[PDB]
Amino acid sequence: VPSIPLDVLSASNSSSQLIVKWNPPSLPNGNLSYYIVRWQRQPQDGYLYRHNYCSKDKIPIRKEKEEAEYRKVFENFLHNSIFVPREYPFFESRVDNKERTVISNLRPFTLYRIDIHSCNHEAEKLGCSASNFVFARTMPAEGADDIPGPVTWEPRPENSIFLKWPEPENPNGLILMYEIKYGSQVEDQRECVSRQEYRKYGGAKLNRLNPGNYTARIQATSLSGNGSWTDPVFFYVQAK
Amino acid sequence: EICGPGIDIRNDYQQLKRLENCTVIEGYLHILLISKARSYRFPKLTVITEYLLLFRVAGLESLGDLFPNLTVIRGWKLFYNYALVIFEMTNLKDIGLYNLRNITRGAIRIEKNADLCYLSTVDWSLILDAVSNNYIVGNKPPKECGDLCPGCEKTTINNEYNYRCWTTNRCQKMCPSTCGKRACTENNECCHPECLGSCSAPDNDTACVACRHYYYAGVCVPACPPNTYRFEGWRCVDRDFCANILSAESSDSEGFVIHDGECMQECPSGFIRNGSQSMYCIPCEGPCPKVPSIPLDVLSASNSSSQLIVKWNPPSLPNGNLSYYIVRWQRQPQDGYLYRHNYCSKDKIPIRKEYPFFESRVDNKERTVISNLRPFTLYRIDIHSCNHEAEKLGCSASNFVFARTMPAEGADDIPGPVTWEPRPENSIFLKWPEPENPNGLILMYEIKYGSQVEDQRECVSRQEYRKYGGAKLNRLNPGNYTARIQATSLSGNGSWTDPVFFYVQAK
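YS: structure for the whole thing
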């Protein structure tokens, strides 16, 4: 059985695309035939979206040789065990000719596992080598995490304002939180809105505002980073 | 049961059941190529003599599924100087093993566990000796594992201090310094000194899980009584037991032999059996028939506020006989970057796709302790290593490390009473004293306050306290109120104040 493919490496050059590179196996044990590549979605982290990123977080801490025996130890055992030298599915494709391939139409900003196998002329009967495998994330759709529609607003008691806006239907990965920028003459005030609040309310109530006219904007943070700010929101607090 | 004299386990989890009755393993353990055919648990296992090997175990997610109580590895014999090897554990995601209290002999090797989290959440220097010999490579990048402890204790990990965890559910449990070098039971009552790890009762050689020196008839003991003899480096056995043990089938298979009060399968180098096959070895009188480098591996810790311990290895190129090392150290300034930022409002976002040099000189050995230190200062350490000729050429360039002192416990708690005043719009202004000697710095304050219960919390920056000496709470509802405040020091949160009681009238 051939070795696993060597030097499996990959990148994403486009949203919905991944490029993958590797080297032929160290020991063909026969004339090499082909490689088999498999890939599997990793899930969007439910473990992560449980965290309230508007809550606390930790402080960022700043700002002569002979030991190849360590393999002989296994090879000699294997040679004495034999007699003598004589959440999601895998997708799969099999390599024709070259130690490179590109996978496309992937979920944008999803993480994938990729497995690559290397097969010799006898692998058709013996089977192919085990996989070498890697993880990579697809490019974000730039601004796809920006707010997919208009903001809406309503007054609330105690000179409060509730702002209502649609959630992005597809994030880059996840919607973590929203930022609200707002103020009377100028948008001095800034608020962090957790995903759990939006999930409850579909929005947030800004409360106990000082009197006056106001403007605002909101910005989402996806796992690909901040989205765009909303269009401005215009609102007012009556003195009377 | 004491299983042995050597276990090679491979292929199937149903063979793993052989441990159902084992609690100590005499000889090696091999665990190879397992990939599931399921739960299995072996809390009976507590001590391994010799080494542990795991190799290409797919299907296993964490070792705390199997061996929560594996408390000591003696390592009396080693795989190429390793007492533990973990290799290619393609699905291993956390160690667990959360009762692991000591590894006596041997180095550590940890390789290609590309999904293994909880890599550096363990203070290896608390468990094992020459950690400089460890090897941790190709595993899951800790920067992107993003380990978590709950929220359990923290310690001066090299230049850092950080929380210590075996896994998200278990911290790297250890005794207080009230036991010193002594072990302890779970509620920190110190063990017997001959004991190792936890004890079902303190100071009782009959209540040990394992013995450091030797074992006999349920008793941990420093050395074998006269008619009792050292066996496999861990227990005493009588003269006639080893006389009844037959070695591996071989042309030279013979009974065991007794020497220095050890029992052995064959005589040690420089000794041979007496010609009667014999119980004793005898020595053969003839030959038996057939400029410095920088210092290495500089490492340091704080056991105590105002103290630092530093350990290192001899230099790579003595270029002579080595004479000694010269250590210099200097107080580093606390980062001026840190003072300006409003950590009560900065959060960042994720993304993916001035002081003197001291000098002292070492006589003989690569260890020293420095004292009368600032209880929470960061120090740069420069170590020079000098051979006999560094006197004329000058001495080597430095190998260097950073370390921070053990924080002064409660030095960051609020030193005096809180004061309060009314303000308009049903507002309250709170003024309170700054800690005199904060562990480095006070970054911010948390205020806990409320009418019936302290639902509301606020963060106060050090700059705000410098301007106002306090903070104003505004547009409260009427009623009676209580509050407390908490500081965040660089050493972490301080203590809460005693409660503050105050009230807001509606008019």
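YS: worth flagging: The helical segments of chain B are 124-127, 142-145, 239-242, 337-340, 390-393, 462-468.
IM: good catch. Also The first strand of chain B starts at residue 2 and ends at 3.
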